[PDB]
Design a protein around this ligand. Structure first.
Ligand code: PP3
Ligand code: PP3
Lengths: 382, 382
C-alpha cells in the first residue's frame, strides 16, 4: 500500500506489545487475556493490533458486532472471537460456522435462533448480566434460568461463559464499583453451573484489582497505551506506552501583511508581518473544527492554528520562513515538546477513547515493529 | 454487499440528481458544473454521487488529493477530475497517465516536476490564485508569470485553467466577497492569455450570483441538499432536497426502577419507573459523545438520549414498552417529526458540512434511485 498525500498516522506495535506483555506478567497464570479490538482496534488497525496482542500473551479477541469479527477471519485471524454486542438470530449459523462466540441476554432471541439453527456446528454463547451499567444484559433470575434452559435444551447451543461490565471502574471512589461486583457475585448463584469462562474486568478494573478478575479480562484502552482516566493515572501498576501519533507536512508557505485575513469567515487577521503555513489535514480526517484554537508542533516548537479549520486543510502561524515539506506533528513529540491524545481530548472536551476512532479512513496507518516500518495501510489505497 | 448490524445510513440519489439538475437549468448553456466529491462525497459515497451528478448535468469532478481521484478511476469513472489540493512533483507522471488535472501555486514545484517528467502524456494544470482566503494559491504577479513561463516552456505541461476560492460567499454581507471578486479580476490581467477554464464559485456564490461564475462552477454542499449557511437559506433560488438520513433499531428494551443508573459514570438516574432502550450506534460510528443530551425519533416521537454515549451503543428513554427491532431514526423523518443535519450540527456546535463526514466507515450506506434500493455499500463488508 502507498499513499499520495503528506498526512499519515503512525502506530508503534512494540508499545502495544509491551502494554499487553506487562499485563500478562501482572495476571495469574490461569487468567486469560481477551484483547478488545473493536472499532478497527480503537482506530489503530484491527488485524495488526490483534496479531501483536496474541503474540504478547492474549489468547482471544473481542469486537463490537458481527461484521468486525468476519473481517478479522477474512484477514486470517484464527483465534477465538467474541462479539460483545447484539446480533440477529438469523445470523447464528454464520457465527457458528466461522467460530465466533456471541453475547446473549434475552430468552426471546434464543427462542428465535433455536427455530432457525440445527447444527452441525456448535454456537458458543456468553451470557451478559446487567449489574448496574444499564446497557445490555439480563436483570432477573426468571429470565436467566429461562436462557440457560433453552441453551441446555439445544444440542448445538453451548454456554461458554458469562460476564458483566462496570460503569465506574475508572473512578477513584469504588462505591458503585463495589456494588456492581457484589451484585455480580449474587447473580452468579442463579446459574445451575458455573461456565468455564467468567469475566467482568476492563482495563481499569484489571489493572487496579488483578485478583478480582476471575478467569478472563477484557483488555482495551490500556493496550493502546492510554489511561482509562486521568484520575487513576497515578494508580497504574506499570507505565503505559502510547502507540498512536499523527503527522503531516507543510505544502505551502507564505508571508502575510498586517490586515490580511485567513480562512472561512475571515475570522483571523494578521496583526503584523507573519509567516503562514498550510497543511493537508482537516475535519474530514478527524481533525475537527473545534480544534481551531489548538496548536501543532513544527521544528520542535508549538505553532498555533489560525482561522477556521477546513475539510481537508488548515493554517498555522510559523516561527519564521520554513521550507515546504517541513514535518508537522499533530499528536506525538518533536524535540522537547510533545502533544498527547489526552491533550487533544482536553481541548475537544471529550475522553481519549474518542480521539483515535475519529481519525478517519482517509488517513493511512504506518506500522512499526522492532524499530522498523512493517507495513502501510491505506483504506482508500489502490 | 450486506451488513450484520441494525445501523445504516440511507442516501437518496434522486435528491442529489434534482439538486444538480435545478442548477443546470439555472446556469448558462456554456457554464460547466464541476461536482465536488472529495471526502467520499461529503460522506455520501464517492462513485455513487459522482455518477448521479454526471447524469444530471455535471461534466467534471473535483477531489481533495490524488488518492481520492485514483479511487474514482479504479471504480470506473472516466470523466475529468481535478485535484484541488497539493500533490508531490514526483507524482505528476501518475496523474498525467490517469488523466487527472492538478492544482499548482508555486514555481518551485513546477521546477521540480519539469526535471522529473518528460512526456508522453500531457499534464493539465489549474492555476490557483489566493484572493483573500489565505489557504492555497499565488499572491504576486512575479510568481504568477514565472509559473506560466515554466508551463509554456515544457512541451507536456498545459495550463487548462485558473481559479480562486471565496472565504465569505455564504454571509449576507458581501463586502469581503466583493473585495475577493475584484481582486480576482485584477490578478487575471497578469496572465498573457486567458485559460479555457476560469472558475471561482462554490455553492453559495453560484446560487447567489450565477451571472458572475465565468465558465465553470464548483458545486459542493448544495448538491447534497444542505444550505451553505442558515443566513442565505432564504436567498436560495430553488428548494434543496436533503439526501442523507441515518437509522438504527432497538436491540434491547427494559424497565428501570427509580434510583437505577445508566451508562458510564452513572451520570443518569431513573427518577421513576421508565422504559429504556438500547441502540447499536456510538461514537466510533460518528455519533459523538457531545450528543448526549440530544434526542432521536422512535415510533414518530422524540426520545431523549440518556447517560453517556458509548463507543458502539447508547441508550434512550422510550414512551412505553416498544418491541425490540423497532426502528429509530437519528437523522431523517418519522411521521410528523424530522431531524435534519442542521439540527445535529447546532447541538454539536459545528456546521452541517462536518456531520456527514464524521459518520464513519463502520456505517453502511444504502442507496436509493427511482424510489427503489439501488445498492448497499459496506466499507468493512466481506
Ligand atoms: C463489554 C465491554 N468489555 C470491554 C470493554 C473495554 O473497555 P476498556 O477499553 O476501558 O478497557 C468495553 C467498553 N469499551 C468502551 C470504548 C465503550 O463501549 O464505550 C466493553 O463494552
Ligand atoms: C477549492 C474549493 N472549491 C469548491 C469547494 C466546495 O464548497 P461548497 O461545498 O461550499 O460548495 C471547496 C470547499 N469545501 C469545504 C468543505 C472546505 O474546504 O472546508 C473548495 O475547497
Amino acid at each position: 500500500n502507498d499513499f499520495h498525500r503528506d498526512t499519515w498516522a503512525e502506530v508503534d506495535l512494540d508499545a502495544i506489545y509491551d502494554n499487553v506483555e506487562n499485563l500478562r506478567r501482572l495476571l495469574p497464570d490461569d487468567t486469560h487475556i481477551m484483547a478488545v479490538v473493536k472499532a478497527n482496534a480503537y482506530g489503530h488497525g484491527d488485524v495488526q493490533v490483534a496479531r501483536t496482542a496474541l503474540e504478547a500473551g492474549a489468547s482471544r479477541l473481542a469486537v463490537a458486532f458481527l461484521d468486525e469479527a468476519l473481517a478479522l477471519r477474512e484477514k486470517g485471524i484464527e483465534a477465538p472471537i467474541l462479539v460483545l454486542g447484539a446480533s440477529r438470530p438469523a445470523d447464528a449459523a454464520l457465527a457458528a460456522q466461522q467460530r465466533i462466540a456471541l453475547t446473549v441476554f434475552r430468552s426471546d432471541w434464543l427462542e428465535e435462533a433455536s427455530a432457525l439453527y440445527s447444527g452441525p456446528f456448535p454456537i458458543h454463547f456468553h451470557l451478559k448480566m446487567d449489574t448496574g451499567m444499564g446497557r445490555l444484559g439480563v436483570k432477573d433470575e426468571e429470565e436467566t434460568k429461562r436462557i440457560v434452559a433453552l441453551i441446555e435444551r439445544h444440542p448445538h447451543f453451548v454456554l461458554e461463559g458469562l460476564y458483566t461490565h462496570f460503569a465506574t471502574a475508572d473512578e477513584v471512589n469504588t462505591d458503585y464499583f463495589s456494588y456492581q461486583y457484589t451484585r455480580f457475585l449474587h447473580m452468579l448463584e442463579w446459574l445451575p453451573s458455573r461456565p468455564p469462562l467468567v469475566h467482568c474486568a476492563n482495563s481499569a478494573a484489571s489493572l487496579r484489582f488483578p485478583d478480582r478478575t476471575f478467569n478472563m479480562v477484557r483488555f482495551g484502552i490500556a493496550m493502546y497505551g492510554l489511561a482509562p482516566s486521568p484520575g487513576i493515572k497515578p494508580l497504574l501498576p506499570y507505565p503505559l506506552k502510547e502507540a498512536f501519533s499523527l503527522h503531516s507536512r507543510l505544502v505551502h508557505v507564505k508571508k502575510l501583511q498586517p490586515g490580511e485575513k485567513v480562512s472561512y469567515g475571515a475570522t483571523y487577521t494578521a496583526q503584523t508581518e507573519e509567516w503562514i503555513g498550510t497543511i493537508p489535514i482537516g475535519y474530514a480526517d478527524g481533525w475537527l473544527r473545534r480544534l481551531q484554537h489548538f496548536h501543532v508542533l513544527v521544528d520542535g516548537q508549538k505553532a498555533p492554528i489560525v482561522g477556521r479549520i477546513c475539510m481537508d486543510q488548515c493554517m498555522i502561524r510559523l516561527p519564521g520562513p520554513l521550507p515546504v515539506g517541513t514535518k508537522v506533528t499533530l499528536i506525538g513529540r518533536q524535540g522537547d515538546e510533545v502533544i498527547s491524545i489526552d491533550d487533544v481530548a482536553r481541548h475537544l472536551e471529550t475522553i481519549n477513547y474518542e480521539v483515535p476512532c475519529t481519525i478517519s479512513y482517509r488517513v493511512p496507518r504506518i506500522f512499526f515493529r522492532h524499530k522498523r516500518i512493517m507495513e502501510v495501510r491505506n483504506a482508500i489505497g489502490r
